Design an enzyme around this catalytic site. Structure first.
Site, PDB file in Angstrom:
ATOM      1  N   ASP A  69      33.704  54.131  44.581  1.00 30.17           N
ATOM      2  CA  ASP A  69      34.424  54.586  45.840  1.00 30.17           C
ATOM      3  C   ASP A  69      35.949  54.562  45.719  1.00 30.17           C
ATOM      4  O   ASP A  69      36.660  54.739  46.736  1.00 30.17           O
ATOM      5  CB  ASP A  69      33.968  53.777  47.072  1.00 30.17           C
ATOM      6  CG  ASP A  69      34.255  52.282  46.954  1.00 30.17           C
ATOM      7  OD1 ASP A  69      35.059  51.898  46.085  1.00 30.17           O
ATOM      8  OD2 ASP A  69      33.667  51.515  47.758  1.00 30.17           O
ATOM      9  N   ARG A  98      40.921  55.460  47.995  1.00 29.42           N
ATOM     10  CA  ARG A  98      39.685  54.882  48.495  1.00 29.42           C
ATOM     11  C   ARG A  98      38.961  55.829  49.462  1.00 29.42           C
ATOM     12  O   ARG A  98      39.539  56.341  50.429  1.00 29.42           O
ATOM     13  CB  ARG A  98      40.075  53.567  49.195  1.00 29.42           C
ATOM     14  CG  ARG A  98      38.883  52.798  49.778  1.00 29.42           C
ATOM     15  CD  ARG A  98      37.852  52.330  48.754  1.00 29.42           C
ATOM     16  NE  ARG A  98      36.903  51.301  49.269  1.00 29.42           N
ATOM     17  CZ  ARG A  98      35.833  51.568  50.031  1.00 29.42           C
ATOM     18  NH1 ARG A  98      35.570  52.785  50.418  1.00 29.42           N
ATOM     19  NH2 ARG A  98      35.025  50.609  50.446  1.00 29.42           N
ATOM     20  N   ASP A 107      30.918  52.414  51.394  1.00 30.70           N
ATOM     21  CA  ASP A 107      31.063  51.256  50.514  1.00 30.70           C
ATOM     22  C   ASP A 107      30.009  51.358  49.394  1.00 30.70           C
ATOM     23  O   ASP A 107      28.808  51.313  49.597  1.00 30.70           O
ATOM     24  CB  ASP A 107      30.946  49.979  51.332  1.00 30.70           C
ATOM     25  CG  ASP A 107      31.395  48.766  50.588  1.00 30.70           C
ATOM     26  OD1 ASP A 107      32.333  48.811  49.811  1.00 30.70           O
ATOM     27  OD2 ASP A 107      30.776  47.759  50.792  1.00 30.70           O
ATOM     28  N   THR A 108      30.481  51.487  48.206  1.00 38.03           N
ATOM     29  CA  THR A 108      29.630  51.302  47.028  1.00 38.03           C
ATOM     30  C   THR A 108      29.621  49.840  46.544  1.00 38.03           C
ATOM     31  O   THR A 108      30.577  49.108  46.707  1.00 38.03           O
ATOM     32  CB  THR A 108      30.092  52.220  45.899  1.00 38.03           C
ATOM     33  OG1 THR A 108      31.504  52.041  45.620  1.00 38.03           O
ATOM     34  CG2 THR A 108      29.827  53.728  46.199  1.00 38.03           C
ATOM     35  N   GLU A 144      30.165  46.866  43.873  1.00 33.80           N
ATOM     36  CA  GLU A 144      31.125  46.684  42.780  1.00 33.80           C
ATOM     37  C   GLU A 144      30.341  46.872  41.485  1.00 33.80           C
ATOM     38  O   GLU A 144      29.100  46.725  41.456  1.00 33.80           O
ATOM     39  CB  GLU A 144      31.839  45.311  42.839  1.00 33.80           C
ATOM     40  CG  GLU A 144      32.571  44.981  44.166  1.00 33.80           C
ATOM     41  CD  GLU A 144      33.756  45.899  44.484  1.00 33.80           C
ATOM     42  OE1 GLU A 144      34.430  46.256  43.490  1.00 33.80           O
ATOM     43  OE2 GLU A 144      34.028  46.241  45.710  1.00 33.80           O
ATOM     44  N   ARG A 186      46.454  52.137  48.882  1.00 31.23           N
ATOM     45  CA  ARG A 186      45.495  53.155  48.473  1.00 31.23           C
ATOM     46  C   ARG A 186      45.507  54.274  49.537  1.00 31.23           C
ATOM     47  O   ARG A 186      45.538  53.980  50.768  1.00 31.23           O
ATOM     48  CB  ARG A 186      44.054  52.587  48.344  1.00 31.23           C
ATOM     49  CG  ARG A 186      43.914  51.515  47.261  1.00 31.23           C
ATOM     50  CD  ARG A 186      42.546  50.945  47.119  1.00 31.23           C
ATOM     51  NE  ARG A 186      42.073  50.385  48.390  1.00 31.23           N
ATOM     52  CZ  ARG A 186      40.923  49.768  48.496  1.00 31.23           C
ATOM     53  NH1 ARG A 186      40.128  49.649  47.424  1.00 31.23           N
ATOM     54  NH2 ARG A 186      40.500  49.416  49.686  1.00 31.23           N
TER      55      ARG A 186
HETATM   56  C1  LIG Z   1      37.627  52.115  53.437  1.00 30.86           C
HETATM   57  C2  LIG Z   1      38.764  51.313  54.026  1.00 30.86           C
HETATM   58  C3  LIG Z   1      39.046  50.055  53.490  1.00 30.86           C
HETATM   59  N1  LIG Z   1      40.064  49.313  53.969  1.00 30.86           N
HETATM   60  C4  LIG Z   1      40.331  47.946  53.469  1.00 30.86           C
HETATM   61  C5  LIG Z   1      39.489  46.933  54.255  1.00 30.86           C
HETATM   62  C6  LIG Z   1      39.099  45.876  53.267  1.00 30.86           C
HETATM   63  O1  LIG Z   1      39.998  44.746  53.400  1.00 30.86           O
HETATM   64  P1  LIG Z   1      39.750  43.443  52.503  1.00 30.86           P
HETATM   65  O2  LIG Z   1      40.240  43.691  51.100  1.00 30.86           O
HETATM   66  O3  LIG Z   1      40.673  42.522  53.241  1.00 30.86           O
HETATM   67  O4  LIG Z   1      38.299  43.082  52.561  1.00 30.86           O
HETATM   68  C7  LIG Z   1      39.175  46.604  51.906  1.00 30.86           C
HETATM   69  C8  LIG Z   1      37.797  47.025  51.381  1.00 30.86           C
HETATM   70  O5  LIG Z   1      37.911  47.920  50.270  1.00 30.86           O
HETATM   71  P2  LIG Z   1      36.921  47.733  49.012  1.00 30.86           P
HETATM   72  O6  LIG Z   1      35.500  47.983  49.487  1.00 30.86           O
HETATM   73  O7  LIG Z   1      37.515  48.741  48.081  1.00 30.86           O
HETATM   74  O8  LIG Z   1      37.129  46.357  48.484  1.00 30.86           O
HETATM   75  O9  LIG Z   1      39.943  47.773  52.116  1.00 30.86           O
HETATM   76  C9  LIG Z   1      40.831  49.807  55.060  1.00 30.86           C
HETATM   77  O10 LIG Z   1      41.746  49.077  55.513  1.00 30.86           O
HETATM   78  N2  LIG Z   1      40.608  51.023  55.602  1.00 30.86           N
HETATM   79  C10 LIG Z   1      39.607  51.813  55.161  1.00 30.86           C
HETATM   80  O11 LIG Z   1      39.443  52.941  55.678  1.00 30.86           O
HETATM   81 CA   LIG Z   2      33.316  48.714  47.181  1.00 30.16          CA
END
Ligand SMILES: Cc1cn([C@H]2C[C@H](OP(=O)(O)O)[C@@H](COP(=O)(O)O)O2)c(=O)[nH]c1=O
Ligand SMILES: [Ca+2]
Length: 129
Positions: A15, A29, A34-35, A37, A75
């Site tokens: 993702d 992103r 959510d994929t 890891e 991102r």
């Molecule tokens: C998909 C997405 C993720 N995120 C943030 C929330 C999560 O915070 P935390 O890192 O604090 O958990 C993190 C999850 O991404 P990943 O699934 O890539 O880790 O990215 C956003 O803020 N907005 C979004 O639209």
């Molecule tokens: Ca992920």
């Protein structure tokens, strides 16, 4: 919403993908998914899937939603298309991602993705097996 051009720099995992957007490198992103890891169950399969999809595309496009365009890690947050097919939707349809991270204002394609998840679940695909 409208599609804008971009070119692949590098596949990262299920993702996240590194693209060149308006001439600048950035990590994207994928909105609304959510994929797992790489180190988790189906993580390698989700990575392979996105990778093939973006590396085989002639044309990558990014589509921003109405809200936030970057997250707190810098991102980009977008829907990504490979020759007109949405990666976000395709991962969900195959059971390689869950609908997730649905925040107010950045949710235009929510219903489309949930519809795909319902069908992946019904078929017991991958994550749903
Ligand atoms: C998909 C997405 C993720 N995120 C943030 C929330 C999560 O915070 P935390 O890192 O604090 O958990 C993190 C999850 O991404 P990943 O699934 O890539 O880790 O990215 C956003 O803020 N907005 C979004 O639209
Ligand atoms: Ca992920």
């Amino acid at each position: 919403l409208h599609k804008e051009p971009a070119t692949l720099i590098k596949a990262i995992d299920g993702d996240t993908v590194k693209l060149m957007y308006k001439g600048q490198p950035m990590t994207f992103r994928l909105l609304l998914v959510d994929t797992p890891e790489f180190n988790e169950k189906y993580g390698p399969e989700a990575s392979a899937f996105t990778k093939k999809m973006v590396e085989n595309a002639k044309k990558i496009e990014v589509e921003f939603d109405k809200g936030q365009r970057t997250d707190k890690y810098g991102r980009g947050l977008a829907y990504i298309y490979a020759d007109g097919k949405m990666v976000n939707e395709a991962l969900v349809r195959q059971g390689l991602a869950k609908v997730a991270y649905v925040y107010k204002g950045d949710n235009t394609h929510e219903q489309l993705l949930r519809k795909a998840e319902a069908q992946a679940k019904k078929e017991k695909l991958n994550i749903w097996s």
